Amino acid sequence: SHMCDAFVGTWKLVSSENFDDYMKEVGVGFATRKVAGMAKPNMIISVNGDVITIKSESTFKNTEISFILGQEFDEVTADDRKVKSTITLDGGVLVHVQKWDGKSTTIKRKREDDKLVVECVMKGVTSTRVYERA
Numbered sequence: 001s002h003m004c005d006a007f008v009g010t011w012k013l014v015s016s017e018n019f020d021d022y023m024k025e026v027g028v029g030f031a032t033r034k035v036a037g038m039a040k041p042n043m044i045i046s047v048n049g050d051v052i053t054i055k056s057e058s059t060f061k062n063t064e065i066s067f068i069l070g071q072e073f074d075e076v077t078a079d080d081r082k083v084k085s086t087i088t089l090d091g092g093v094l095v096h097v098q099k100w101d102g103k104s105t106t107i108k109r110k111r112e113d114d115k116l117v118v119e120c121v122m123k124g125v126t127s128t129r130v131y132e133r134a
């Protein structure tokens with residue numbers, strides 16, 4: 001299919017802005033915010049047929065999701081929320097919506113130049129996380 005070719009690979013976090021405020025808006029507690037905010041994760045994206053896998057590896061937590069676009073799944077997030085997730089491709093952007101406890105957050109992953117830019121939005125608060133090839 002080649003749907004996500006330009007996302008595939010191993011990516012390393014190189015910059016972050018407003019992530020603590022995003023985590024506050026999500027409801028993450030103090031200690032997790034502090035430890036999670038230090039992490040410099042590897043994001044590893046691969047595709048096999050229709051199944052996309054995204055791994056996040058860091059000193060804080062190692063997470064993994066596998067999914068088919070448009071098909072809801074269960075996710076336990078790094079901060080231990082139990083959420084219902086749906087990921088779609090919209091105009092070349094991977095759009096990941098998480099629902100839990102009547103709340104919602106959206107994580108967008110986009111290729112921009114040689115970077116993979118991750119925008120995390122909770123209500124009025126956005127955090128931008130910039131990844132480069134590992």
Ligand SMILES: Cc1c(Cl)cccc1Nc1ccccc1C(=O)O
Pocket residue numbers: 013023028032036041077078079107118129
């Ligand atoms: C670590 C974490 C917590 Cl604790 C809460 C909520 C989000 C994260 N992380 C992330 C989740 C999705 C995409 C990127 C990141 C990132 O760390 O860049």
